[PDB]
Amino acid sequence: LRSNIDLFYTPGEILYGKRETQQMPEVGQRLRVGGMVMPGSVQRDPNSLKVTFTIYDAEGSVDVSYEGILPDLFREGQGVVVQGELEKGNHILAKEVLAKHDENYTPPEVEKAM
């Protein structure tokens, strides 16, 4: 199947199969995944920007480690997007976390590489 940039999964598709059976990701790879943050799941380090949360949908759930400056929109019970790398089973090392605030990403060849 095609569409969008990169690939993507969900908290069903990382466990059950990508939207039919297209493949499963590598425990060695980078990927992206939307899901709804479970309430209460978001632990954050009392002294650090580390997070641990779970994201689910009407199907299954996955865990997320993130560490860093979290979207100020990110909330307990909204439909976020993760991206980063597969940890082990159904857990993602997020590398950014996004709060479905549309997002766009300006490339290099505009800012200071015109």
Residues 6+ apart with CB under 8 A from 60: 11, 12, 14, 15, 16, 90
Q: Is 91 annotated as a binding residue?
A: no
Q: Give the start-to-end residue ranges of the domains of the chain.
A: 1-114
Q: Is 101 annotated as a binding residue?
A: yes
Task: CATH number for 1-114: choose from 3.30.420.10, 1.10.260.40, 2.40.50.140, 1.20.120.1200.
Answer: 2.40.50.140
Distances (CA, A) of 88 to 2, 17, 98: 26, 16, 22
Q: How many CA atoms lie within 13 A of 111 on its CB side?
A: 4
What is the residue whose two structure tokens read 């954050």?
44
94 neighbors 84 (Cβ within 8 angstroms): yes
